[PDB]
């Protein structure tokens, strides 16, 4: 049915960890489908300290119609998927924010 | 008070009524008690009932009432659900608390005149039989058994039977 | 058209006290009425409450046993009879009182579909 | 407080027949009567309200009648679909007693 | 019924009122007939005609009332469109039912009230020259003839001249 | 004019009424005045300003009502708006205008029941001791000093001991 | 102030059927009334409907030859005569029936534009 | 079924003058009269309704009156664009009857 | 439970006017009674309006040299008192006319907190 | 027009005894009475509206009672935070008038 | 008065179209106005097939 994609990108904090990591600067992701036909070019040299990490990343997805085919072209900075979904829609939902347990009734 | 009858009239309700609504109390020489009218208080429960019942069900429901959270650069978007949320809401509270108020006036003097009604139908009925008397009370003039009760909550009066008794009792002397 | 679900199957030993629900379907005001289905007698009301005056009238014969409550918040009445005996073994069926004509009071108007209640060994 | 006396306690007949069943009561208990058939192992069902009103979705063979303590229930004619026992109801005071069931099989 | 004259003490309608509403019917001497209350009937269906018009006219007009379209990106804007065009139906739907109720029942009682008053202006034209009797009718002591019903209707109606007829007629004997 | 006193058979208003709303005139011999009714008027005072005050009070208050602007390519969103912002104000201005005219008709049938409770609040202090006439006035039969409008306005208005006077007026001669 | 916008203009030979329109500004409830202007003779009214009551009165010298209906979903009056006859040249006026105080009936109130009806070889 | 015969049946006058339209009725009309003035060539328009209301929009120098069988429109001055023909309808009980006509021309 | 905001404190030369608000907390239509405390001396009320009756009453003792006007747009009551004189120096209070069974009419329900006004060289 | 004679001028007490304050008026104002206690250098405040009822947020140690010219203010005990001066109004005619001021001090 | 102007630029889903096609790779498209001055720089290698 129609099945959710998820992904990233990773922004290293300068242009060593590019150039030591993925051996090569100027790396582009494009993921491509019916609809969906964005490109993502990462290649930023610094960034603040955040939980301690300095580098940055950015998670997109997107939704795979029945019958439909999505395509990931890349040659660097990519976060593959490893556990893709298959949602079936339903419509009316949304997130509570509490901090009760959980029960039955 | 609309009508006049509750607070009116009838100066004060009776604690022994447990049965139904608008009773009565025939301290008649057979006995006395407090026997309900049981048309006119099932009928008004009846039109008690339809009215809440129609507040509760009109209302329609949905899965979602709730709004959605959005980050720090769709403050249109927060801001433009606040305000739907807060007008939603704001146009709920004042039609619910004037519903709530205006029906609460309706169900006050529609009980005002059930017991106004009745209180004409029984004076109909007895026309000059029975004189009046504050509180909504009443004084048969003739002699007036249990069977008084059967004709009087069942409507079936017939004033001309007692009519000559009532008309000796007007002077007495 | 108010669908009326009661409770399930369900048996208990003499002297203890039993719970059979009639959860609606929507929320309603109108009276609940129970009533007990014997194999080989006839039916017999046994208590109920109407939502307005709030009081819970009950048969002269079952009054104290039996107890009634149904929280206006749920309109979801209860069915409570202490001290259960093995003659009550029996089908319960509750009523929501309600005709075409709006909700009527002394009435039945829809009914519910029956909960197995015995009580033998 | 008041008993439902059914009247006649049971008789049979076939498809498409005059019966009545006479509800009998010692107070009157003006025209809050019901009338209700009672299939054998289901839920029990009303057919007349209030002594003359009729229930929605009800065949129109049923006809009640009567006030005070004599009522009345003319079937104009009888299905393969309605044979079941019989209950009348008061309702003009607490308590609410039921009837003694009048069955009706194939003759 | 708040008022308790249709479907109270007027136990039921007449088929033949055609050109009126709050009709009569005169069983006198010259003929008979079922003559409207032309003033009561044309106030009352003026006022009905008031009500229905504002019902209408208030509503207000724009030139759309049709929820846009999105894509699949923009998830939050198709859910919010559909909570404010559900929401503004849920109030709509709310608020119409429970006026088309509440203003039923205020016309129901507004006819109540107009067969009440005119039940009591005729009483109180009258005051004791007719005895009243159930339904809502009338029983003239004196004779009567056509000019009583221009003289009622006209709200003219003299007692003294009719007044010792009455007087004769209350005992007869 | 539901309950029919106001415009109905108490023809005309009083331009002399200051002090009070339900007044009276007392036309004796000790002299004249328009004397209100202070028990009555300061009750239909009270629950005018009730409903006034809870027209105004229940509606909730927020900081702003403001539409936003949007720039030349978020249509969507400026119509969006102008859809919430019209319908809120298509809502406000069908519920604020059947209030004000509904509960301007509560408001007059109001004023049309304090007047009828009144008269049939005297009509029953005084039952026949004083004849009903016209434009809803009295005319009392015994002879009726200023100690009468003491009693009248208090409700003390002890029937016996004027009962015999009215009994002797009835016919006088 | 309901702008009245009556049908155009037309022509027919004896012996038919005549449809003038009476299409209103907007929807209302109030009575009809139409009304004949024959050169050289003065007004009478011929018929008209109550959305109140319902019934379609008429003149008592031309019931069966007309007929007024006004759909209250459009509120627009529609006007027929069977039968059509040459003295019956005429312009017809439709009426509203809405004044200053609301809308009142047995009056006029606001009234039509005219529609130029006559009937000749 | 009631005729209105109008009366005058036609008069001529000047600029600010002192006119007044009878409206003859055989039965009671009550008070439900009106007042209509008809331009040559132009849609007709009321001026009083009920006998005693005045319409909006309209100059205060018509003042209408009578009930029962006798009515009267007293105008307090003629001015040059009030001149046409007047009719008088009944709608106490239908069917509703216009009148003759009253003309008023320059003298 | 208006919380009523009166105006400061001025004093001002004999034979002049004065200007004491009411500014209350929010809308509201009750009656407004105002109050005199001259120092040593029990109160005594002067003058008052009614947004109903609309009419500005006063003590048969005070009409003309003082008037009463609170405009119902912004409920605020506003005092003035024309030809000050000395032995008017005092502190008022300012009444809203509202206790806890709604706003009652011919009670004070809550105050205000008052404003010194003292006439003097 | 109607003025309320306050009896007794002027008593001392002491911490939980019985005092009673009346209000005597010419002219019979029904049951429109009020009770005022005015604590020096404060806001007066009012403890009895109708004679009866009894503002929110009292003690109840305070009931009024009376009608007509006769009116009365019965304090069940006296604590030392309720000694002040007492004024009663009238409201049944306008205009208004309060009272003198019975004073209560520690004995 | 207000005119509408539509435009549209292509993604060939190689690059030996945009080789073979416009003689050149990195092709932008800068449509300028007063109140529009958003750039274009289709370059992509790859689609699905969607309608043939």
């Known amino acids: 049915k129609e099945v959710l994609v998820l992904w990233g990108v990773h922004h290293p904090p300068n242009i060593g960890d590019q150039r030591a990591l993925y051996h090569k600067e100027n790396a582009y992701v494009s993921v491509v489908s019916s609809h969906y036909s964005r490109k993502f070019t990462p290649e930023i040299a610094k960034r603040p300290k955040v939980r301690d990490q300095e580098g940055r990343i950015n998670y997109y997805w997107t939704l795979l119609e029945p019958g439909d085919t999505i395509i990931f072209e890349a040659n660097g900075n990519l976060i593959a998927p490893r556990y893709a979904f298959a949602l079936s829609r339903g419509f009316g939902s949304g997130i509570i924010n509490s901090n009760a347990p959980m029960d039955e009734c | 008070g609309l009508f006049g009858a509750i607070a009116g009239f009838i100066e004060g309700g009776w604690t022994g009524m447990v049965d139904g609504w608008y009773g009565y109390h025939h301290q008649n020489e057979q006995g006395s008690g407090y026997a309900a009218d049981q048309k006119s208080t099932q009928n008004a429960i009846n039109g008690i009932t339809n009215k809440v019942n129609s507040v509760i069900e009109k209302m329609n429901t949905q899965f979602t009432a709730v709004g959605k959270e959005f980050n720090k650069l769709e403050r249109r978007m927060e801001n433009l659900n606040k305000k739907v949320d807060d007008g939603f809401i704001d146009i709920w509270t004042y039609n619910a608390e004037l519903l709530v108020l205006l029906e609460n006036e309706r169900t006050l003097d529609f009980h005002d005149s059930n017991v106004k009604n009745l209180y004409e139908k029984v004076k109909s009925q007895l026309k000059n039989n029975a004189k009046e008397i504050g509180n909504g009370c009443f004084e048969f003039y003739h002699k007036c058994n249990d069977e008084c009760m059967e004709s009087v909550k069942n409507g079936t009066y017939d004033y001309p039977k007692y009519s000559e008794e009532s008309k000796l009792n007007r002077e007495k002397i | 058209e108010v669908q009326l679900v009661q409770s399930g199957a369900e048996v208990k030993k003499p002297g203890s006290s039993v719970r059979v629900s009639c959860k609606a379907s929507g929320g309603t005001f109108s009276a609940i009425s129970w009533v007990r289905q014997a194999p080989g007698q006839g039916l017999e009301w046994m208590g109920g409450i109407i939502p307005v005056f709030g009081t819970a009238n009950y048969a002269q014969k079952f009054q104290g046993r039996v107890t009634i409550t149904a929280d206006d918040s749920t309109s979801t009445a209860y069915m409570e009879v202490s001290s259960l005996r093995s003659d009550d073994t029996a089908v319960?069926?509750?009523?929501?009182?309600?005709?075409?004509?709006?909700?009527?009071?002394?009435?039945?108007?829809?009914?519910?579909?029956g909960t197995m209640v015995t009580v033998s060994s | 407080d008041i008993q439902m006396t059914q009247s006649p306690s049971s008789l049979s007949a076939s498809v498409g027949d005059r019966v009545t069943i006479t509800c009998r009561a010692s107070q009157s208990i003006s025209s809050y009567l019901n009338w209700y058939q009672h299939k054998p192992g289901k839920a029990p069902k009303l057919?007349?309200?209030?002594?003359?009103?009729?229930?929605s979705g009800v065949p129109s063979r049923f006809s009640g009648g009567g006030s005070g303590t004599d009522f009345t229930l003319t079937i104009s004619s009888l299905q393969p679909e309605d044979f079941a026992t019989?209950?009348?109801?008061?309702?003009?005071?607490?308590?609410?007693?039921?009837?003694?069931g009048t069955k009706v099989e194939i003759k | 019924g708040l008022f308790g004259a249709i479907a109270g003490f007027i136990e039921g309608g007449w088929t033949g009122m055609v050109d009126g509403w709050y009709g009569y019917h005169h069983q006198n001497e010259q003929g008979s007939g079922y003559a409207a209350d032309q003033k009561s009937t044309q106030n009352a269906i003026n006022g009905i005609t008031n009500k229905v018009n504002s019902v209408i006219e208030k509503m207000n007009t724009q030139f759309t009332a049709v929820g846009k379209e999105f894509n699949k990106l923009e998830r939050r804007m198709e859910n919010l469109n559909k909570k404010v065009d559900d929401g503004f139906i849920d109030i709509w739907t709310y608020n119409a039912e429970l006026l088309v109720l509440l203003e039923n029942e205020r016309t129901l009682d507004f006819h109540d009230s107009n067969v009440k008053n005119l039940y009591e202006k005729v009483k109180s034209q009258l005051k004791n020259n007719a005895k009243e009797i159930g339904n809502g009718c009338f029983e003239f002591y004196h004779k009567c003839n056509d000019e009583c019903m221009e003289s009622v209707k006209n709200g003219t109606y003299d007692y003294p001249k009719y007044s010792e007829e009455s007087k004769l007629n209350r005992e007869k004997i | 004019g539901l309950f029919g006193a106001i415009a109905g058979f108490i023809e005309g208003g009083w331009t002399g009424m200051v002090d009070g709303w339900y007044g009276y005139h007392h036309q004796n011999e000790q002299g004249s005045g328009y004397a209100a009714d202070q028990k009555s008027t300061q009750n239909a005072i009270n629950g005018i300003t009730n409903k006034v005050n809870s027209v105004i009070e229940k509606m909730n208050t927020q900081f702003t009502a403001v539409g936003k602007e949007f720039n030349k390519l978020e249509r969507r969103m400026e119509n969006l708006n102008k859809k919430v912002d019209d319908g809120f104000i298509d809502i406000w201005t069908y519920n604020a205008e059947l209030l004000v005219l509904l509960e301007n008709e509560r408001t007059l049938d109001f004023h049309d029941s304090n007047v009828k409770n009144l008269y049939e609040k005297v009509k029953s202090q005084l039952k026949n001791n004083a004849k009903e006439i016209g434009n809803g006035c009295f005319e009392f039969y015994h002879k009726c000093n200023d100690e009468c409008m003491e009693s009248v306005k208090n409700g003390t208005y002890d029937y016996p001991k004027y009962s015999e006077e009215s009994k002797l007026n009835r016919e006088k001669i | 102030e309901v702008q009245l916008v009556q049908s155009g203009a037309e022509v027919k030979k004896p012996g038919s059927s005549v449809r003038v329109s009476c299409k209103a500004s907007g929807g209302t409830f109030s009575a009809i009334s139409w009304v004949r202007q024959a050169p050289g003779q003065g007004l009478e009214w011929m018929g008209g409907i109550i959305p109140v009551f319902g019934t379609a009165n008429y003149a008592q010298k031309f019931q069966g030859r007309v007929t007024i209906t006004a759909d209250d979903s459009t509120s627009t009056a529609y006007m027929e005569v069977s039968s059509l006859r040459s003295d019956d040249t005429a312009v017809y006026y439709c009426?509203?029936?809405?004044?200053?105080?609301?809308?009142?009936?047995?009056?006029?109130?606001?009234w039509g534009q005219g529609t130029m009806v006559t009937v000749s070889s | 079924d009631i005729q209105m015969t109008q009366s005058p049946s036609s008069l001529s006058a000047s600029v600010g003058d002192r006119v007044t339209i009878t409206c003859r009725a055989s039965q009671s009309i009550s008070s439900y009269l009106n007042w209509y003035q008809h331009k040559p060539g132009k849609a007709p328009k009321l001026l009083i309704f009920?006998?005693?209301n005045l319409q909006s929009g309209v100059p205060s120098r018509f003042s209408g009156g009578g009930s029962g069988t006798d009515f009267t429109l007293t105008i307090s001055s003629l001015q040059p664009e009030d001149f046409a023909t007047y009719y008088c309808?009944?709608?106490?009980?239908?069917?509703?009857?216009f009148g003759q006509g009253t003309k008023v021309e320059i003298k | 439970e208006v919380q009523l905001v009166q105006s400061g404190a001025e004093v001002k030369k004999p034979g002049s006017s004065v200007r004491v608000s009411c500014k209350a907390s929010g809308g509201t239509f009750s009656a407004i009674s105002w109050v005199r405390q001259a120092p040593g001396q029990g109160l005594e009320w002067m003058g008052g309006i009614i947004p109903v009756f609309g009419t500005a009453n006063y003590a048969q003792k005070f009409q003309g040299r003082v008037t009463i006007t609170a405009d119902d747009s912004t409920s605020t009551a506003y005092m003035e008192v024309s030809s000050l004189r000395s032995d008017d120096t005092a502190v008022?209070?300012?009444?809203?006319?509202?206790?806890?069974?709604?706003?009652?009419?011919?009670?004070?329900?809550?105050?205000?907190?008052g404003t010194m006004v003292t006439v003097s060289s | 027009d109607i003025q309320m004679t306050q009896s007794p001028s002027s008593l001392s007490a002491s911490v939980g005894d019985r005092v009673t304050i009346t209000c005597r008026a010419s002219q019979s104002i029904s049951s429109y009475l009020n009770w005022y206690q005015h604590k020096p250098g404060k806001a007066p405040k009012l403890?009895?509206?109708?004679?009866?009822?009894?503002?929110s947020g009292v003690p109840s140690r305070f009931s009024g009672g009376g009608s007509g010219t006769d009116f009365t203010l019965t304090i069940s005990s006296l604590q030392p935070e309720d000694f002040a001066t007492?004024?009663?109004?009238?409201?049944?005619?306008?205009?208004?008038?309060?009272?003198?001021g019975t004073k209560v001090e520690i004995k | 008065k207000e005119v509408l102007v539509l435009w549209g630029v292509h993604h060939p889903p190689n690059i030996g179209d945009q080789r073979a096609l416009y003689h050149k790779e990195n092709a932008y498209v800068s449509v300028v106005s007063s109140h529009y001055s958003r750039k274009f720089t289709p370059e992509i290698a790859k689609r699905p097939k969607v309608r043939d």
């Open positions: 009920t006998a005693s």
């Open positions: 309808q009944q709608s106490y009980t239908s069917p509703r009857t």
């Open positions: 009426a509203r029936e809405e004044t200053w105080k609301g809308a009142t009936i047995g009056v006029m109130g606001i």
